[PDB]
């Protein structure tokens, strides 16, 4: 018994949790997923690894989970763990709603899940959840919001970020192009298309390969929509027709 | 009785391709009225409302936990809930407290979100479902409401006539009950729109 | 070395090393001896001091009016067992209003101590006991090992360098059954004495005595109440 | 026996309570306070059973303060009211129910002034004005007679005085003094006690 | 006496892999092959039920099992694990029916079963299931075909294959099959893609077939399978 | 190579207990002296920075008005035992209306000895021994008493005792200077002397703590000035 | 039983009778109804003797542990709150207890009434027991915050005395304690028979 | 449940898991704190200034109650846990006792918590250290610090995290009764200490102050820039016209 | 409520009325009291309506699981056992009174099941407030080995006796015929009861109801 125990909730000599880091490595080999904040909304854009000629497509999405009428999330890592965590997030949101009769602030939801993940890192002897998450939402306290959480139960708020394969490059590119206080949903969409176009291994980029969702505020209600393939192709074509435009100048 | 502690009345009525649900507005404690704007009808999706009469606490609580489970349903599955399914859900929720029941007798009224076929039902305090093709009632003035509904209800009624009928039934039944009234509210729902009205009523 | 660390692991030769290692804990303790006449049961124990400015370790504990013990090994396990025995005796007096038979108390100790020698992550009790008692079948001296085994002794000694005492006792067994109390305690003291180099000997500072009998409840003597026993011994010279 | 009253104006909430702590046939305390600060803009007026009132009220209070310390912002009067209502409703069918009747006064930066009424059965009801206790039976009507939604806080205090005077006239219980507080955009303000110099 | 190992047997490698899951998948890709085709008006599941002797009574154990009246299952990998998952799936379906008085949607059943599968990749003292599942169903007019793997992940397919030579069966499906097929044609191409591997004479007792139209899930009689295996009918 | 926390060495000892004993050898050294006029306890604070408030270092605490305790080793572990001892004394007072004997308190704390283990235990049980040595100094019906306890659970009465890193040297020095008829003044004096001998820093008023328990006076921790008056007579 | 307590400029006066009955039968006349919890904390006994004594003893234990742990002494408010919270968990089980916790604090003289029902209120004057109504009559007629110490003593003593006169379940002796900043002092323990001759003639 | 000894003794008498936890702390952002007369200031170093990140969501200076604030260094998640537990206990103290909370009390609670996690089956030590800062009733200002072991002490000034030794040395050399004679001087001392290990900026320094019965005050980068400016001025009006 | 069951030559006829009352007020005129257990097993329910509903549904579910696992058609003894053990466990607090009937490999079987958990296997049974009338009909006109239409007539007659002689019963008659190779779920058998035609038109015309407030909400 002491022999077979892999000891998953234990410090390493350098003062770190090996399983958490290895989980981060698992995340690194997952579909690229990024999120960008704006002044009139916030968006998620993710690489689709479920891209085969014989897939049936019965769901609204693949990596975009609706959590709440004012909140949505995207994921990267092991998908089943993502199903678990997303279900739990929904549960938490509904508990808050039952208790206070008003929507849960996004930060509170993220923290609530992150404490569970942390708990998994500290005791139990179980493997952690090989999953990182991006949260987009709106609330009456901080308006439009983008968050990110790691399997360590560690989270942070961002104006723009990426997660998954080639995340670092995407982050650098975002650091270049971003526009604090001067961001719009259109511009942010362009930026997403750009970074996704460079980071994705498979070039050219078909709508069959990307998945975009926006969260915006219309008439007192919160609207979350997944972009149809047509709009996506419009965005890509726009990107190429702008890229072939700046290359003329030489 | 426990049900008569706060009083109140809830009614639902079938139409052609429409449906109606109504309730009084009084929140009182025994003989004393506290408020005249108490909500007893709750939206459980587009074209699907639930009416709760009885003990006010359990009205609010059942409504809230119902919204809880319903939201979870509409998230796990990618669809609004069907009326029969909502009825079974409420039935389950109430029967979970078989030996310590919530004191409410719910009434469900809605259109099939896929079709448009009207659906109405009512349940026990322990969740025994009952579907009809005409009307359902629940409240301290049940006998009164039965009396009115049996004499006013016609089969294939249009929205306006369904409205007039359910309104007259509610008004005249409630006006013979001391712990029901202080206003009436009617939701008449059809395929394209939802009309919400408050009736001119006695306030005594 | 792979059959060393768990009590639930048999060795390929039919042994359990954790039990034996536990048995070794008895030998690390100061020696103690126990013998019986036909009327009395006596424990004699060589106390032991860390430094000169520290008192000598308690070796004899009271269990019930008719039962006392002498310990050898881990003192925590000793106090554990002691509390167990006390509680069992109290239970017996409470329910039956008669003193608990010594052999049954011992059997209970065996049962209790056997249990953790079969469960994973559990350890044997690291303590050996000598039990002096008197009941309807007369005086009794028992010996309990970490192996959860127990013995009905005519006399015995356990602890460091107790082989000598064992030999001496083995010589004078035939005398014991007819000895008087003074002579019995004497023999016990000599047995305890043979467990020492010629340089050191018994004192009113490093000896504890425990007696129980037909006319005497279990009693512990030390300090100056030991002097009447010692001052009556032959200055055995090298 | 205990009296609570709340009157909501367009941009303020006025609250008042009796100051008597009574047992048997004697008044044991005459400066008792029925109010509980829960936020900078929320008051909880609790009344009822001996130990249940303070236990419940303080539990709620420390939990609201906990929310504030954990999240950086305070609860809205609505979220607060539904919180206390949830707690009260969950204990209802338990071994340890709480016999408390309560008012919750508050001011939100968005939705404005709010007054909530709660029965001991945990039925929550928003109202322009409310009252708890036997005295309510003699005061509510007066409010009904003289309340208008645009009532000034001065007129509100005058009306309050009318109710309390009525209490002095018809009510068999003593009740000589009354705690009076008011909540607005700037927080909770203590007003002079309404008293009737008997002896 | 017994308690239980409370630590994970499935852990991350430094490469970031859940090794036991991939070894489980290795166990799947060593079992008899199975094919599933969604065909407009119905769904077909078929598998190689090849025994090891004439002594085996093939009319006793089945690989194509019903979950309810409208949902069916086949697998690739270890049998006993599959059996466990079948019991569990049936139970889940019945719980759903007790709560909603409405037959369980195929996708919901798939999600719940997948959750059960995920548990055994993280809970203590257990290994993951060595089974991939193909689940067919009829709900809300449309037909449905899902696959769930030992990680607890699931995918919706128009058509697919699992087990031995699942890659070549998959390609064969990608070419020699597409939409607007009636269930009959689908059965035809299903037995056809199974035949791309079934070493030996493929009889009516060498394979098992199940169908799912809007009349319910059912296992095909050996007679019907013979008629189909006449390279005709 | 990892084995259970309840594993025996071939010598017949528990590895964890022995390693805990080893862990004590890093602790601040402490001295206790028993005397018919009272019991004294002295310990070095070991301040590692001028920025550290030394008054927040208490290696001597009051178990009760007639019992004090000096601790060495892992102080964090000691706090638990101290609290348990205090609670024990208060329970004894509650039940019997009389104070605890020093030996009884010591025994009580010693009952938490080998109460550690993995399998077959509560989910809130200790995983390892306490890495701490204790010196209880008290006054009761048997007069002034001083006891010593180690992670083995074995507790024993002592006339003069030293625990800590410089245990051996200090103990020898104590042996050379102790007799069962000293005054409390001679005891305190001796303690401070040997302490200064073994301490690496220069002995001063804000560098050690000293406490006495006398038959006529409750547990007393010496103030800065009271310490100065003693250090004066070096 | 008749107990009273009031706080004034110079501290807290605590007084009690000493009679204990079992029905009409007088079981004792030597009951210490002022409970010395601490050298700085006084309680009173009304209702069930056992309940008051036991729970306030538990209180004393808790207060001592508090003093050891926090190196400071508990406040009157924290003590009364502790007692109230302890007693509240047995609500409806039949505990009969009406006590007054008196002390001196950072906030000065403290006086709290604590019930077995759940009450816990701070105040200037209190009286508990079957004779409380009678004691209130004289105490209220004589009370002032600016009373002199001897005046306070005389007031408390007289109130308890008149209470013994009217109430059949109160009598024996009048015991009187004074809580000052440096702790409490046992002021007096006069017999009712003596007080009769002192007061009437 | 999981009942395995994680933290055990080594042959040399060390608690390895606790030491590794302390290493984890040593990899943390530098946090310092100093105590003044009517002011107490805490400042934390590297905020991982990604600039694409919301600073508010990554602050390492929290408030436990209106009375007590705290900084930390180590594993941010563990810190979140300990912080929230400390908050609950801060409120429960108000429930069980009419009086609020002393800094030493909450410090003791947190410390005992960590120690408990060093000695319980299945659990793993919190890999954080905390700087607790407050003003108790009676007005005495106090600063304590805890450790993954469970040990805790009072300080006049201290630092934790990456390069804690350096800043500790600096503070040892600079803490006087002349410095921290005014609020603006104590804050200045904190910024001066932090700039001795930070990558030399001012946009990389978070600073919070508490004073009297007033609430915690976080300093906006404008005020911080101003203080660092007067700092660089005094570092060129008393250090330039001399050397 | 009046429910009955009988055993004939080729199987079993179950009968029920359709009135559901709350107190002494008719709530439902067309209540279904004949419940599906298994394709070959059906159950009439009297007593506490919710309890009969949940009991019968639970047993149906467990039996579906059972037959799904066994691959065979459920037996009536199984249903009887499950029901009676569940009911006994709850000591009558589950107010389910049942008439259980079905056809097996062993043939047709009819049990009556009481809320305390006692059962009786009988060729004819009645339960409910109208059970004595129906039982009278049976005891007067029952013969063993009847034919289908004769049995249907007998049962409908018993249910009618209940309907017209018991205030708890009324409205229509439901039959369920179960044979070795047929299932006739006739619902309803024959409604011997009708509301009299409306003599008047109490139709209210638009505008006759005064309205204080209106609010139209467009959907999609």
Swiss-Prot record, chain A:
Localization per record: Cytoplasm; Nucleus
Name of a matching Pfam family: Proteasome
InterPro entries: Ntn_hydrolases_N, Proteasome_alpha, Proteasome_alpha-type, Proteasome_asu_N, Proteasome_bsu_CS, Proteasome_sua/b
SUPFAM superfamilies associated with the record: N-terminal nucleophile aminohydrolases (Ntn hydrolases)
NCBIfam families for the chain: PRK03996.1 (NF003075)
Role summary: Component of the 20S core proteasome complex involved in the proteolytic degradation of most intracellular proteins. This complex plays numerous essential roles within the cell by associating with different regulatory particles. Associated with two 19S regulatory particles, forms the 26S proteasome and thus participates in the ATP-dependent degradation of ubiquitinated proteins.
Protein's UniProt name: Proteasome subunit alpha type-4
UniProtKB/Swiss-Prot annotation, chain D:
Top-level taxon of origin: Eukaryota
Induction cue: Up-regulated in ovarian cancer cell lines.
Keywords linked to the UniProt accession: Acetylation, Cytoplasm, Host-virus interaction, Nucleus, Proteasome
Family statement drawn from the similarity comment of this UniProt entry: Belongs to the peptidase T1B family.
One BP term from GO: proteasome-mediated ubiquitin-dependent protein catabolic process
The keyword Membrane belongs to this UniProt entry's keyword annotation: no
Subunit comment: The 26S proteasome consists of a 20S proteasome core and two 19S regulatory subunits. The 20S proteasome core is a barrel-shaped complex made of 28 subunits that are arranged in four stacked rings. The two outer rings are each formed by seven alpha subunits, and the two inner rings are formed by seven beta subunits. The proteolytic activity is exerted by three beta-subunits PSMB5, PSMB6 and PSMB7. (Microbial infection) Interacts with HIV-1 protein Tat.
Family annotation (Pfam families): Proteasome (PF00227)
Modified residues (N-acetylmethionine): 1
Function in brief: Non-catalytic component of the 20S core proteasome complex involved in the proteolytic degradation of most intracellular proteins. This complex plays numerous essential roles within the cell by associating with different regulatory particles. Associated with two 19S regulatory particles, forms the 26S proteasome and thus participates in the ATP-dependent degradation of ubiquitinated proteins.
UniProt name for this protein: Proteasome subunit beta type-2
Subcellular location: Cytoplasm; Nucleus
Curated annotation (Swiss-Prot), chain F:
Keyword Repeat: no
Key word Iron present: no
Gene3D superfamilies registered for this protein in UniProt: Glutamine Phosphoribosylpyrophosphate, subunit 1, domain 1
Main location: cytoplasm
Phosphothreonine modifications at: 48
Pfam families: Proteasome (PF00227), Proteasome_A_N (PF10584)
Family matches, as InterPro entries: Ntn_hydrolases_N (IPR029055), Proteasome_alpha (IPR050115), Proteasome_alpha-type (IPR023332), Proteasome_alpha_type_5 (IPR033812), Proteasome_asu_N (IPR000426), Proteasome_sua/b (IPR001353)
Signal peptide: none
Transmembrane segments: none
Tissues and organs where the protein is expressed, per its UniProt entry: Expressed in fetal brain (at protein level).
Induction: Up-regulated in colon cancer cell lines. Up-regulated in fetal Down syndrome (DS) brain (at protein level). May be the target of the transcriptional activator NFE2L2.
Subcellular location, record wording: Cytoplasm; Nucleus
Listed GO biological process terms: proteasome-mediated ubiquitin-dependent protein catabolic process
Protein function: Component of the 20S core proteasome complex involved in the proteolytic degradation of most intracellular proteins. This complex plays numerous essential roles within the cell by associating with different regulatory particles. Associated with two 19S regulatory particles, forms the 26S proteasome and thus participates in the ATP-dependent degradation of ubiquitinated proteins.
Record-stated family: Belongs to the peptidase T1A family.
Entry protein name: Proteasome subunit alpha type-5
Native species: Homo sapiens
Swiss-Prot record, chain I:
Keyword annotations: Cytoplasm, Host-virus interaction, Hydrolase, Nucleus, Protease, Proteasome, Threonine protease, Zymogen
Reaction catalyzed: Cleavage of peptide bonds with very broad specificity
Enzyme class at the top of the EC tree: hydrolase
EC number(s) reported in the record: 3.4.25.1
Segments forming a coiled coil: none
Tissue note: Expressed at a low level in colonic mucosa. Up-regulated in colorectal cancer tissues.
A GO term, aspect molecular function: threonine-type endopeptidase activity
Active site, renumbered: 1
One Gene Ontology term, aspect cellular component: proteasome core complex, beta-subunit complex
Record's subcellular location: Cytoplasm; Nucleus
Gene Ontology biological-process entries: proteasome-mediated ubiquitin-dependent protein catabolic process
Family to which this protein belongs: Belongs to the peptidase T1B family.
Function according to Swiss-Prot or TrEMBL: Component of the 20S core proteasome complex involved in the proteolytic degradation of most intracellular proteins. This complex plays numerous essential roles within the cell by associating with different regulatory particles. Associated with two 19S regulatory particles, forms the 26S proteasome and thus participates in the ATP-dependent degradation of ubiquitinated proteins.
Quaternary structure and interacting proteins, as annotated: The 26S proteasome consists of a 20S proteasome core and two 19S regulatory subunits. The 20S proteasome core is a barrel-shaped complex made of 28 subunits that are arranged in four stacked rings. The two outer rings are each formed by seven alpha subunits, and the two inner rings are formed by seven beta subunits. The proteolytic activity is exerted by three beta-subunits PSMB5, PSMB6 and PSMB7.
């Amino acid at each position: 018994s002491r022999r077979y125990d892999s000891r998953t909730t234990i410090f390493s000599p350098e003062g770190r949790l090996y399983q958490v880091e290895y989980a981060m490595e698992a995340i690194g080999h997952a579909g690229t997923c990024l999120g960008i904040l704006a002044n009139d909304g916030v968006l998620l854009a993710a690489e689709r690894r479920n891209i085969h000629k014989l897939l049936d497509e019965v769901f609204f999405s693949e990596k975009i989970y609706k959590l709440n009428e004012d909140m949505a999330c995207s994921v990267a890592g092991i998908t089943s763990d993502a199903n678990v965590l997303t279900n739990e997030l929904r549960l938490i949101a509904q508990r808050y709603l039952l208790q206070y009769q008003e929507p849960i602030p996004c930060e509170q939801l993220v923290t609530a899940l992150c404490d569970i993940k942390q708990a998994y890192t500290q005791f139990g002897g179980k493997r952690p959840f090989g999953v990182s998450l991006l949260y987009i939402g709106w609330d009456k306290h901080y308006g439009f919001q983008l968050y990110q959480s790691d399997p360590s139960g560690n989270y942070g708020g961002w104006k723009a970020t990426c997660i998954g394969n080639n995340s670092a490059a995407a982050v650098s590119m975002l650091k270049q192009d971003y526009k604090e206080g001067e961001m719009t949903l259109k511009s942010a969409l362009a930026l997403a298309i750009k970074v996704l176009n460079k980071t994705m291994d498979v070039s050219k980029l078909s709508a069959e390969k990307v998945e975009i969702a926006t969260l915006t505020r219309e008439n007192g209600k919160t609207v979350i929509r997944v972009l149809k393939q047509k709009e996506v192709e419009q965005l890509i074509k726009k990107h190429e027709e702008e890229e072939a435009k700046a290359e003329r100048e030489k | 009785s426990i049900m008569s502690y706060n009083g109140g009345a809830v009614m639902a009525m079938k139409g052609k391709n429409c449906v109606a649900i109504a309730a009084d507005r009084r929140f009182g404690i025994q003989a004393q009225m506290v408020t005249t704007d108490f909500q007893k009808i709750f939206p459980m999706g587009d074209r699907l409302y639930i009416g709760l009469a009885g003990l006010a606490t359990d009205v609010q609580t059942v409504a809230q936990r119902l919204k809880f489970r319903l939201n979870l349903y509409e998230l796990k599955e990618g669809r609004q809930i069907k009326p029969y399914t909502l009825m079974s859900m409420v039935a389950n929720l109430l029967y979970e407290k078989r030996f310590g029941p919530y004191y409410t007798e719910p009434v469900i009224a809605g259109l099939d979100p896929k079709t448009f076929k009207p659906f109405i039902c009512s349940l026990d305090l322990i969740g025994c479902p009952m579907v009809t093709d005409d009307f359902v009632v629940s409240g301290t003035c049940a006998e009164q409401m039965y009396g009115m509904c049996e004499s006013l209800w016609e089969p294939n009624m249009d929205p306006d006539h369904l409205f007039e009928t359910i309104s007259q039934a509610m008004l005249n039944a409630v006006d013979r009950d001391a712990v029901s009234g202080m206003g009436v509210i009617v939701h008449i729902i059809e395929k394209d729109k939802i009309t919400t009205r408050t009736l001119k009523a006695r306030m005594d | 070395n792979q059959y060393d660390n768990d009590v639930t692991v048999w060795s390929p030769q039919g042994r359990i090393h954790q039990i034996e290692y536990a048995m070794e804990a008895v030998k690390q303790g100061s020696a103690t001896v126990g013998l019986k006449s036909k009327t009395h049961a006596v424990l004699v124990a060589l106390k032991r001091a860390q430094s000169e400015l520290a008192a000598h370790q308690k070796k004899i504990l009271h269990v019930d009016n008719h039962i006392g013990i002498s310990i050898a090994g881990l003192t925590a396990d000793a106090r554990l067992l002691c509390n167990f025995m006390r509680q069992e005796c109290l239970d017996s007096r409470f329910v039956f209003d008669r003193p608990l038979p010594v052999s049954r108390l011992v059997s209970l100790i065996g049962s209790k101590t056997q249990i953790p020698t079969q469960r994973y992550g559990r350890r044997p009790y690291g303590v050996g006991l000598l039990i002096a008692g008197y009941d309807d079948m007369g005086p009794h001296i028992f010996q309990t090992c970490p192996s959860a085994n127990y013995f009905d002794c005519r006399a015995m000694s356990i602890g460091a360098r107790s082989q000598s005492a064992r030999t001496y006792l083995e010589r004078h067994m035939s005398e014991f059954m007819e000895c008087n109390l003074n002579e019995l305690v004497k023999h016990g003291l000599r047995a305890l004495r043979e467990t020492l180099p010629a340089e050191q000997d018994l004192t009113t500072k490093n000896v504890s005595i425990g007696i129980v009998g037909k006319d005497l409840e279990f009693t512990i003597y030390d300090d100056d109440d030991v002097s009447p026993f010692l001052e009556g011994l032959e200055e055995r010279p090298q | 026996m205990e009296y609570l009253i709340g009157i909501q104006g367009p941009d303020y909430v006025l609250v008042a309570s009796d100051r008597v702590a009574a047992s048997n046939i004697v008044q044991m305390k005459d400066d008792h306070d029925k109010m509980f600060k829960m936020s900078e803009k929320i008051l909880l007026l609790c009344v009822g059973e001996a130990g249940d009132t303070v236990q419940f009220a303080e539990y709620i209070q420390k939990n609201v303060q906990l929310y504030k310390m954990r999240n950086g912002y305070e609860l809205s009067p609505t979220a607060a009211a539904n919180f206390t209502r949830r707690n009260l409703a969950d204990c209802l069918r338990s071994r340890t129910p709480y016999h408390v009747n309560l008012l919750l006064a508050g001011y939100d930066e968005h939705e404005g002034p709010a007054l909530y009424y709660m029965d001991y059965l945990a039925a929550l009801a928003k109202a322009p004005f409310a009252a708890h206790g036997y005295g309510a039976f003699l005061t509510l009507s007066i409010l009904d007679r003289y309340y208008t939604p645009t009532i000034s806080r001065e007129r509100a205090v005058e009306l309050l005085r009318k109710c309390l005077e009525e209490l002095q006239k018809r009510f068999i219980l003593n009740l000589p003094t009354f705690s009076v507080r008011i909540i607005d955009k700037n927080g909770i303000h203590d007003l002079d006690n309404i008293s009737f110099p008997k002896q | 006496a017994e308690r239980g190992y409370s630590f994970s047997l499935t852990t991350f490698s430094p490469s970031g892999k859940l090794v036991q899951i991939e070894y489980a998948l290795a166990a799947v890709a060593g079992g008899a092959p199975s094919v599933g085709i969604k065909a407009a008006n119905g769904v077909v599941l078929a598998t190689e039920k090849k025994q090891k002797s004439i002594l085996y009574d093939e009319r006793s154990v089945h690989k194509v099992e019903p979950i309810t009246k409208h949902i069916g299952l086949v697998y690739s990998g270890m049998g006993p694990d599959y059996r466990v998952l079948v019991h569990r799936a049936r139970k889940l379906a019945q719980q759903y029916y007790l709560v909603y008085q409405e037959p369980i949607p195929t996708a919901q059943l798939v999600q719940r079963v997948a959750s059960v599968m995920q548990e055994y990749t993280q809970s203590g003292g257990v290994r993951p299931f060595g089974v991939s599942l193909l689940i067919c169903g009829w709900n809300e007019g449309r037909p449905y075909l899902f696959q769930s793997d030992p990680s607890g992940a699931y995918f919706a397919w128009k058509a697919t294959a699992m087990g031995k030579n699942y890659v070549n069966g998959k390609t064969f499906l990608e070419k020699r099959y597409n939409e607007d097929l009636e269930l009959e044609d689908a059965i035809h191409t299903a037995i056809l893609t199974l035949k791309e591997s079934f070493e030996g004479q493929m009889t009516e007792d060498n394979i098992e077939v199940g169908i799912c139209n809007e009349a319910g899930f059912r296992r095909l009689t050996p007679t019907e399978v013979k008629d189909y295996l006449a390279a005709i009918a | 190579y990892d084995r259970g926390v309840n594993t025996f060495s071939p010598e017949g000892r528990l590895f964890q207990v022995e390693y805990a004993i080893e862990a004590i050898k890093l602790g601040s050294t402490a001295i206790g002296i028993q005397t018919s006029e009272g019991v004294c306890l002295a310990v070095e604070k070991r301040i590692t920075s001028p920025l550290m408030e030394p008054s927040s270092i208490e290696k001597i605490v009051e178990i009760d008005a007639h019992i004090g305790c000096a601790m060495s080793g892992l102080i964090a572990d000691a706090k638990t035992l101290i609290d348990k001892a205090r609670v024990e004394t208060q329970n004894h007072w509650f039940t019997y209306n009389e104070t605890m004997t020093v030996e009884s308190v010591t025994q009580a704390v010693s009952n938490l000895a080998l109460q550690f283990g993995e399998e077959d235990a509560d989910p809130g049980a200790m995983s390892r021994p306490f890495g701490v040595a204790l010196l209880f100094g008290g006054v009761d019906e048997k007069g002034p008493q001083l006891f010593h306890m180690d992670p083995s659970g074995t507790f024993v009465q002592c006339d003069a005792r030293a625990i800590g890193s410089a245990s051996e040297g200090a103990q020898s020095s104590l042996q050379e200077v102790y007799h069962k008829s000293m005054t409390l003044k001679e005891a305190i004096k001796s303690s401070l002397i040997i302490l200064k001998q073994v301490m690496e820093e220069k002995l001063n008023a804000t560098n050690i703590e000293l406490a006495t328990v006398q038959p006529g006076q409750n547990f007393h921790m010496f103030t800065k000035e009271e310490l100065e008056e003693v250090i004066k007579d070096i | 039983t008749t107990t009273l307590a009031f706080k004034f400029r110079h501290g807290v006066i605590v007084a009690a009778d000493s009679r204990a009955t079992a029905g009409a039968y007088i079981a004792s006349q030597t009951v210490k109804k002022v409970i010395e919890i601490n050298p700085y904390l006084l309680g009173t006994m009304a209702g069930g003797a056992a309940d008051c004594s036991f729970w306030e003893r538990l209180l004393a234990r808790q207060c001592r542990i508090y003093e050891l742990r926090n190196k400071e002494r508990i406040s009157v408010a924290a003590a009364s709150k502790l007692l109230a919270n302890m007693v509240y968990q047995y609500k409806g089980m039949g505990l009969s207890m009406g006590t007054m916790i008196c002390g001196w604090d950072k906030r000065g003289p403290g006086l709290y009434y604590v019930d077995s029902e759940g009450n816990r209120i701070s105040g200037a004057t209190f009286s508990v027991g079957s004779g409380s109504v009678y004691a209130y009559g004289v105490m209220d007629r004589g009370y002032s915050y600016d009373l002199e110490v001897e005046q306070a003593y005389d007031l408390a003593r007289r109130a308890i005395y008149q209470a013994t006169y009217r109430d059949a379940y109160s009598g024996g002796a009048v015991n009187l304690y004074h809580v000052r900043e440096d702790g409490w002092i046992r002021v007096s323990s006069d017999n009712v028979a003596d007080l009769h001759e002192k007061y009437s003639g | 449940s999981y009942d395995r000894a994680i933290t055990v003794f080594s042959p040399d008498g060390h608690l390895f898991q606790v030491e590794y936890a302390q290493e984890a702390v040593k990899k943390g952002s530098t946090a310092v704190g100093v105590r003044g007369r009517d002011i107490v200031v805490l400042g934390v170093e590297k905020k991982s200034v990604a600039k694409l990140q919301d600073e508010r969501t990554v602050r390492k200076i929290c408030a436990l109650d209106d009375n007590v604030c705290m900084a930390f260094a180590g594993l941010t998640a563990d810190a979140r846990i300990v912080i929230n537990r400390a908050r609950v206990e801060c409120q429960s103290h108000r429930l069980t006792v009419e009086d609020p909370v002393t800094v030493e009390y909450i410090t003791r609670y947190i410390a005992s918590l960590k120690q408990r996690y060093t000695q319980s089956n299945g659990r793993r030590p919190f890999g954080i250290s905390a700087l607790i800062v407050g003003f108790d009733f009676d007005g005495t200002p106090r600063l304590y610090q805890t450790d993954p072991s469970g040990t805790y002490h009072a300080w006049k000034a201290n630092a934790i995290g990456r390069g804690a030794k350096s800043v500790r040395e600096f503070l040892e050399k600079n803490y006087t009764d002349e410095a921290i004679e005014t609020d603006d001087l104590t804050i200045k001392l904190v910024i001066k200490a932090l700039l001795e290990v930070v990558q030399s900026g001012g946009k990389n320094i978070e600073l919070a102050v508490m004073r009297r019965d007033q609430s915690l005050k976080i300093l906006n980068p404008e005020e911080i820039e101003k203080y660092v400016a007067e700092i660089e001025k005094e570092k060129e009006e008393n250090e330039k016209k001399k050397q | 409520t009046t429910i009955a069951g009988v055993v004939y030559k080729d199987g079993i006829v179950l009968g029920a009325d359709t009135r559901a009352t709350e107190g002494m007020v008719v709530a439902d005129k067309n209540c279904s009291k004949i419940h599906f257990i298994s394709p070959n097993i059906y159950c009439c329910g009297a007593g506490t309506a919710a309890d009969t509903d949940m009991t019968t549904q639970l047993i149906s579910s467990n039996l579906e699981l059972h037959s799904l696992s066994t691959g065979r058609l459920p037996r009536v003894v199984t249903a009887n056992r499950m029901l009676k053990q569940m009911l006994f466990r709850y000591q009558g607090y589950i107010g389910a009174a049942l008439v259980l009937g079905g056809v097996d490999v062993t043939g047709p079987h009819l049990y009556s099941i009481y809320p305390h958990g006692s059962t009786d296997k009988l060729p004819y049974v009645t339960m409910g407030s109208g059970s004595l009338a129906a039982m009278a009909v049976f005891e007067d006109k029952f013969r063993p080995d009847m034919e289908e239409e004769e049995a249907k007539n007998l049962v409908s007659e018993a249910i009618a006796a209940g309907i017209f002689n018991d205030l708890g019963s009324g409205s229509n008659i439901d039959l369920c015929v179960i044979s070795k190779n047929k299932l006739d779920f006739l619902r309803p058998y024959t409604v011997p009861n009708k509301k009299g035609t409306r003599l008047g038109r109490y139709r209210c015309e638009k505008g006759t109801t005064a309205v204080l407030t209106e609010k139209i909400t467009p959907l999609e």
